[PDB]
Design a protein around this ligand. Structure first.
Ligand SMILES: [Mg+2]
Ligand SMILES: [Zn+2]
Lengths: 166, 108, 214, 293, 152
């Protein structure tokens, strides 16, 4: 197995000179061996990516899934250890930068069929990973405008060369 | 009818990450004025509702203790009184149910 | 019921702890306290007759300075050499993922031996000797995050500190030494420096059936 | 005579000087204790920094719901700005638009929208022409439209605005709402307030009557970007707490001599209380109708 | 095609639907406030209104007597129907019940509903209250109402 997320949480940085940006806090949390499928957990994580922490907890509180309850508990633990251990000032001032799911260690059971045939059940487990970053959630990328489209097109037309000559 | 070929992960990622399959963001979530917990704006507050439910459960325990056995529903109205309250003159011929707590502020 | 037992090199407590006098910092029975001190002194000299209480305070200052430089450099082996096991965790655990920048500027007044106490023989064959010494010095402190952001103190400006450090030596150990055991802070001590960050103390998280009583 | 630009940067420079003077008056970190005594999340102690932390900092400590729904602060029973530094240990309570009695929040929204419309006027009328700003009278909300008093030019004593000009004022106010500026606050000595507003006799009279009303002669100055105005109380945190805005009407007050006072009337509604198209149109008609104090 | 089909297909059939609704109606008469899946509560809400109408018709009517005999499976609530609930709603015309959505069942995530008879002795539900008259929009529209009343 591998357990590198818990050590990512424990990387330490050198002290900052007084003229640099503040370098916002990063908190890495995970839960291992969740009796749930990593695909459904992917759906829940992809919903909660890029959100503020309170927006995430609202969506998880009113989703209808077992994984949603589990992820909400993990996020509450991450916020608590953020403002208990990593010097985050305001507990609302966190956003989900990374949130993903991974395969866990599974088990194999026999699934009986008709005649004398059988199938292999997989009792599936997964992991949940979250990275919290201090600060407001970053703005979503605005849609590309017609100005941007025309500017890129004219950039290509000015980028054209004479192929296969001097 | 069996698959003729294996579907690739690019096909499968298109199918499984199409926005029809993704979870929709809810916009009907509001903060409950009484307790501050989150609620959906067309749904009762879970916290306040289970508050009312637990007090109703205690009152029903006292009601069942007063009846004492099945098939004994009264033919009169019922009123619940808390500690430090006398029955009113309007609450004259009504079955009184006593509760061993102060009357909660949300109960009138 | 194995006959191997844990060989402790320290104790949990302060032996007849020196109560700090009111006004010791504000101003810039004695015979009984003094006689008990010299009783412990003759016990210490009986167990090792090359000890001088006049020579102790400079060694005490050196131990204090080098232990705090061990905190500066995270030198846990030398910090074990100079500091007891009762004093290690409450000196390192809250530093483990932080960077501390400490320095010794000067000493305002020479350090003074204010109490000497000793244990009984019954402590599993081991007899401990404790000496409390008053320190009044000038030091700097700057504690950083995991991320290198400052949380406490300031960089170069020094501030005055007063502390009542208790040392202990296991005298029955042939290779024992004088190490920092604890330090008494007075109950009348001035409030420490405020932290650089903002703190919210939560109220009672109430179950639904509960009502909030002031 | 100074150019309007140079007047604007003079006022901004003196405002920043006063704010830095207060910050240097409080250089050391000091911890006060603020008790949240609201109905929700009850009896919660915040340990704030003196003259640095804000009710908005209390809200960040609680949740983003408090940040996005808390408009006014009840600090020890009096209305307090979201972005005003806290000066002492106190008890705090956050006031939203949809409380049982939101009247203080209503007054704050009214004064903020009047101040925005004053800024729109001042940076809307031409360079050749002279614009003076008199007051923002305390007009009750049930009247329908917030009002500002402007002295315009003797060359424009006969000029009446058209619907295109009124829509221009409305679009400038919407540009401000898009710009999303915080309502910066400052408790300022009356002498420094006169030092901000020398070149305005009506502003001098307003500052003088406020300094007469309070004992210590401390007036309330507010800033949105580069525009500075004296107020009659606390304001809402941000211009983005406005969703529906309109500068409805311009009217001339009855005494034409010695000077022509023009009352600009507008109506507005926040994001939390936005109304439908038809209801808003009816409110536009009533706000276009004249409002007498 | 199910145009104009006003009844839900519940239970194991039509009779099983009627027996489900009858059990729920008996529970509602006994406890005066129950919770259940939302669709079942809607159907039983309609049946509860018509049951209170029969109770107001009264005990000396043999038709109402037979209907209460069928629809109350406890046989003690029929005196409660005729002598408590109908005297309670002798003044109202038809607003006897209150049905409100409660979040989700925690097992199968069913949409839930609580239904009560008005009056009651129980603690009141956290009913949704409309916005107060003192807010901005309500004050502006109150001024509008005053102005129109003055004008006409
Ligand atoms: Mg079915
Ligand atoms: Zn609630």
């Amino acid at each position: 197995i591998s357990r590198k997320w818990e050590k990512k949480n424990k990387i330490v940085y050198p002290p900052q000179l007084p003229g640099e940006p503040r370098r916002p806090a990063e908190i890495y949390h995970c839960r291992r061996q969740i009796k749930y499928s990593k695909d459904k957990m992917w759906y829940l994580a992809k919903l909660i990516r890029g959100m503020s922490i309170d927006q995430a907890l609202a969506q998880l509180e009113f989703n209808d899934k077992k994984g949603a309850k589990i992820i909400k508990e993990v996020l509450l633990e991450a916020q608590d250890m953020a403002v208990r251990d990593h010097n985050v000032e305001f507990r609302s001032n966190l956003y989900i930068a990374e949130s993903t799911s991974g395969r866990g260690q599974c088990l194999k059971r026999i699934r009986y069929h008709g005649r004398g045939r059988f199938g292999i059940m997989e009792k599936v487990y997964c992991h949940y990973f979250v990275k919290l970053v201090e600060g407001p959630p970053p703005p979503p990328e605005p849609p590309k405008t017609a100005v941007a489209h025309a500017k890129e097109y004219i950039q290509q037309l000015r980028s054209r060369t004479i192929v296969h000559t001097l | 009818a069996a698959p003729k070929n294996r579907r690739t992960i690019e096909v499968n990622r298109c199918r499984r990450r199409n926005p029809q399959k993704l979870i929709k963001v809810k916009n009907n979530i509001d903060v409950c004025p009484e307790c501050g917990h989150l609620k959906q704006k067309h749904v009762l507050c879970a916290y306040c509702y289970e508050k009312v439910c637990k007090e109703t459960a205690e009152i029903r325990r006292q009601i069942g203790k007063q009846e004492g056995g099945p098939f004994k529903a009264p033919t009169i109205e019922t009123v619940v009184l808390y500690t430090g309250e006398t029955p009113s003159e309007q609450d004259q011929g009504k079955r009184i149910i006593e509760r061993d707590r102060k009357r909660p502020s949300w109960f009138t | 019921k194995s006959d191997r037992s844990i060989h402790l090199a320290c104790t949990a407590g302060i032996f007849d702890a020196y109560v700090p006098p009111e006004g010791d910092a504000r101003i810039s029975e004695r015979m009984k306290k003094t006689m008990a001190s010299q009783v412990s002194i003759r016990r210490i000299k009986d167990y090792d007759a090359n000890f001088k209480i006049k020579d102790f305070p400079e060694k005490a200052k050196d131990i204090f300075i080098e232990a705090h430089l061990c905190l500066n450099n995270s030198d846990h082996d030398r910090l074990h050499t100079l500091v007891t096991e009762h004093c290690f965790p409450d000196m390192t655990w809250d530093i483990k993922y932080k960077t501390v920048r400490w320095s010794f500027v000067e000493s305002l007044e020479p350090s003074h031996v204010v109490q000497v106490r000793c244990s009984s023989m019954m402590n599993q064959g081991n007899v401990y000797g404790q000496i409390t010494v008053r320190m009044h010095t000038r030091q700097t402190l700057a504690i950083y995050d995991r991320f290198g952001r400052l949380m406490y103190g300031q960089e170069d400006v020094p501030k005055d500190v007063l502390e009542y450090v208790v040392f202990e030596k296991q005298l029955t150990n042939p290779y024992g030494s004088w190490r920092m055991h604890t330090k008494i802070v007075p109950p009348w001590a001035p409030p420490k420096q405020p932290i650089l960050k903002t703190v919210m103390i939560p109220g009672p998280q109430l179950k639904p059936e509960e009502e909030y009583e002031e | 005579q100074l150019s309007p630009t140079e007047l604007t940067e003079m006022r901004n420079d003196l405002f920043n000087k006063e704010k830095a003077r207060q910050l240097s008056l409080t250089p050391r970190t000091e911890k006060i204790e603020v008790k949240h005594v609201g109905k929700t999340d009850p009896g919660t102690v915040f340990v704030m920094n003196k003259n640095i932390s804000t009710p908005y900092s209390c809200a960040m400590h609680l949740s983003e719901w408090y940040c996005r729904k808390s408009i006014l602060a009840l600090v020890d029973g009096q209305p307090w700005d979201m972005y005003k530094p806290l000066t002492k240990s106190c008890e705090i309570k956050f006031l939203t638009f949809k409380d049982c009695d939101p009247g203080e929040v209503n007054k704050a929204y009214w004064r903020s929208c009047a101040m925005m419309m004053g800024c729109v006027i001042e940076r809307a009328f031409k360079d050749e022409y002279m614009v003076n700003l008199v007051r923002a009278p305390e007009v009750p909300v049930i009247s329908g439209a917030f009002c500002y008093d402007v002295v315009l030019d003797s060359k424009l004593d006969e000029w009446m605005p058209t619907k295109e000009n009124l829509r221009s004022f409305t679009k400038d106010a919407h540009a401000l709402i898009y710009k999303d500026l915080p309502f910066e606050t400052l408790e300022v000595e009356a002498k420094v307030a006169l030092e901000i507003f020398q070149h305005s006799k009506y502003k001098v009279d307003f500052i003088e009557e406020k300094a007469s009303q309070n004992p210590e002669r401390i007036v309330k100055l507010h800033r949105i970007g580069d525009f500075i105005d004296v107020s009659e109380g606390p304001l809402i945190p941000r211009t983005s707490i406005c969703f529906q805005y309109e500068v409805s009407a311009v009217h001339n007050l009855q005494p034409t001599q010695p000077s022509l006072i023009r009352r600009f009337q507008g109506v507005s509604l926040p994001v939390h209380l936005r109304a439908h198209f038809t209801i808003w149109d009816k409110l536009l008609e009533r706000s276009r109708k004249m409002v007498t104090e | 095609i199910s145009h104009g089909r006003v009844f839900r297909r519940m239970g194991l059939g039509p009779e099983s639907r009627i027996h489900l609704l009858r059990n729920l109606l008996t529970g509602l008469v006994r406890h005066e406030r129950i919770e259940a899946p939302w669709a079942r509560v809607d159907e039983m809400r309609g049946y509860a209104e018509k049951l209170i109408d029969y109770g107001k018709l009264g005990d000396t009517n043999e038709r109402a007597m037979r209907m209460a005999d069928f629809w109350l499976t406890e046989k003690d609530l029929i005196p409660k129907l005729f002598q408590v609930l109908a005297p309670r709603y002798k003044d109202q015309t038809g607003g006897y019940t209150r049905m409100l959505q409660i979040p989700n069942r925690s097992l199968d995530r069913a949409k839930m509903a609580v239904i009560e008879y008005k009056g009651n002795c129980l603690p009141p539900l956290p009913l949704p209250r409309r916005d107060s008259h003192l807010t901005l929009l309500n004050q502006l529209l109150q001024g509008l109402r005053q102005d129109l009343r003055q004008s006409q």
